[PDB]
Paper text:
Our previous work revealed a curdlan-specific endo-β-1,3-glucanase, [name], from a marine bacterium [name] 2-40T, which contains an N-terminal GH128 module and a C-terminal CBM6 module. [name] exhibits catalytic activity at intermediate temperatures and efficiently produces GOS with DPs of 3–6 from curdlan. The CBM6 module of [name] ([name]-CBM6) exhibits a strong binding affinity specifically to curdlan, effectively enhancing the enzyme’s activity against curdlan. The GH128 and CBM6 modules form a cohesive structural entity, jointly recognizing triple-helical β-1,3-glucans.
The crystal structure of [name] complexed with GOS was obtained through cocrystallization of the [name] inactive mutant of [name] with laminarihexaose (L6) and determined at a high resolution of 1.28 Å. This complex structure enabled the mapping of two β-1,3-GOS chains within the catalytic groove of the GH128 domain: one spanning from the -4 to -1 subsites and the other extending from the + 1 to + 5 subsites. The cleavage of the glycosidic bond between the − 1 and + 1 subsites might be attributed to residual enzyme activity of the [name] mutant enzyme at high crystallization concentrations. The elongated catalytic groove of [name] aptly accommodates the curved conformations of the two GOS chains, which collectively form a single-helical structure. This structural characteristic correlates with [name]'s preference for linear curdlan over branched laminarin, as well as its distinctive cleavage pattern yielding products L3 to L6. The interactions within the negative-subsite region are primarily governed by two conserved hydrophobic residues: W141, spanning from − 4 to − 2, and W117 at the − 2 subsite. The glucoside at the − 1 subsite establishes hydrogen bonds with N167, Q168, H245, and E272. Furthermore, a β-configuration is trapped within the − 1 subsite, which aligns with the retaining mechanism observed in the GH128 family. We were fortunate to observe glucosyl moieties from + 1 to + 5 in the complex structure of [name]. Furthermore, W256 and Y250 (corresponding to S198 and Y194 of PvGH128_II, respectively) provide aromatic platforms for the + 4 and + 5 glucosides, respectively.
Author numbering: 82 to 473
Amino acid sequence: HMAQDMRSEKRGLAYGYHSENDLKAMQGKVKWWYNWDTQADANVKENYASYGYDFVPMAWDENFNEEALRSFLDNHPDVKYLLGWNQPNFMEQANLTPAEAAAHWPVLEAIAQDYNLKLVAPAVNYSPGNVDIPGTDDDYDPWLYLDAFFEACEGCQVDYIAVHCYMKYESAFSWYVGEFERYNKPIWVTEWAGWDDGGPANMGEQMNFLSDTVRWMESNDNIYRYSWFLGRSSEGYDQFPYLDVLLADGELTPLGSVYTSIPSNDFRYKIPARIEAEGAHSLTGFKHLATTDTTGLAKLIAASNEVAEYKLNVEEGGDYTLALRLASSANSDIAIRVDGLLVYTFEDINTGGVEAWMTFSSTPISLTAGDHILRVESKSSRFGFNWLELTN
Ligand SMILES: OC[C@H]1O[C@@H](O[C@@H]2[C@@H](O)[C@H](O[C@@H]3[C@@H](O)[C@H](O[C@H]4[C@H](O)[C@@H](CO)O[C@](O)(O[C@@H]5[C@@H](O)[C@H](O)O[C@H](CO)[C@H]5O)[C@@H]4O)O[C@H](CO)[C@H]3O)O[C@H](CO)[C@H]2O)[C@H](O)[C@@H](O)[C@@H]1O
Ligand SMILES: OC[C@H]1O[C@@H](O[C@@H]2[C@@H](O)[C@H](O[C@@H]3[C@@H](O)[C@H](O[C@@H]4[C@@H](O)[C@H](O)O[C@H](CO)[C@H]4O)O[C@H](CO)[C@H]3O)O[C@H](CO)[C@H]2O)[C@H](O)[C@@H](O)[C@@H]1O
Ligand SMILES: OC[C@H]1O[C@@H](O)[C@H](O)[C@@H](O)[C@@H]1O
Ligand SMILES: [Mg+2]
């Protein structure tokens, strides 16, 4: 039962109904959260900090309960950030022109001064265009909105940019978020999921999109924080567009397992440990699906020559046995490398079905103390891969 280091410093969640069991389930894998509101969720307000979280209050629009916000900040001095207006460029959200959003900003600056907070700019996305931006017909444009906001907010304290995105193509997401780097402030992606343009065709597509975009954000130094939309949805995890991270109390969905398992660039796994397959530091080709296996929640799926790499901090050199939890309708071959060198091949792995699971163990593999890359390579095979375990 190896206690791993903090999996990510950037990763957060957008959700307002956490239990303590929910925070414990994500502990050490999620750093922060917000709930669109002025104080932490009632059932975790007393104890959230003891599980490693910081809570980020929000002033959703200019009519936010300032008394409630200041009272919360009086009792929670670890709070470091405050989020400004939610989608002011949407008539159905905060509904403030750039000039109005700037005119109300001093209320937030006074709170930031009083409690030593940094401020996140109002969150924007492409909009229906029903909040006017002066000087353009392109009222839908989020950069034109922020340009006008900053021009009106002369001298304002704005430490970070907030971005929402509902595109479903990872290359569109990276282009879009990258456009906000022009303002020379670290970015918080405070809501995203694949949803527009028809959205995901199935849960696996959303899991793949989440993986691609989380991995891009972990590697982009200009991204400060990100939070998936959202913890739980009213319709639930298996209904389009498959949003939920949390399932039953204190438990994750398949998508939430992917979200919480993906490591930062600098995180390193300690061993002996079981490591979820979806916690790879690097994936080439591998895709994601839910699994019906008796443990675990998500699986990687190979169809050809896919590669997954896991970066290890081996504190005790020695001979470790590698177990893989696998499903394979035909014969699968899987090559295992350490720092690029072949140490073992699983040969003719066959379970008889895509959700017929077995655990397969290697011979002992010599690992010296230090940093190593464990590489799991499909050799022209079709299989599912739930988790791995290194034992000594
Ligand atoms: O239900 C209301 C709801 O609205 C939310 O805000 C929406 C907002 O999300 C929406 O944004 C669209 C956006 O999805 C669209 O993305 C484009 C990219 O601009 C484009 C740039 O390269 O890439 C994409 O992916 O197109 C290419 C693919 O078609 C193709 O396959 O090739 C590439 C992939 O290989 C892709 O690049 C995307 O399609 O962009 C348009 C503008 O161009 C945005 O409008 O816009 C809505 C209004 O029109 C908003 O309402 C809001 O957050 C939420 O609160 C609210 O509830
Ligand atoms: O500050 C005072 C104002 O309080 C307003 O009540 C807010 C309430 O609106 C807020 O609801 C949020 C939604 O804003 C959020 O909508 C999503 C968008 O943020 C996003 O961009 O798009 C998605 C679509 O994909 C929207 O669903 O969704 C979350 C989660 O469902 C809601 O919690 O919540 C605040 C905290 O509870 C609450 O204060 C009120 O409407 C104003 O009249 C009032 O002035
Ligand atoms: O001109 C109409 C504009 O409407 C907006 O809602 C869209 O996001 C733009 O892509 C489009 O060009
Ligand atoms: Mg798994």
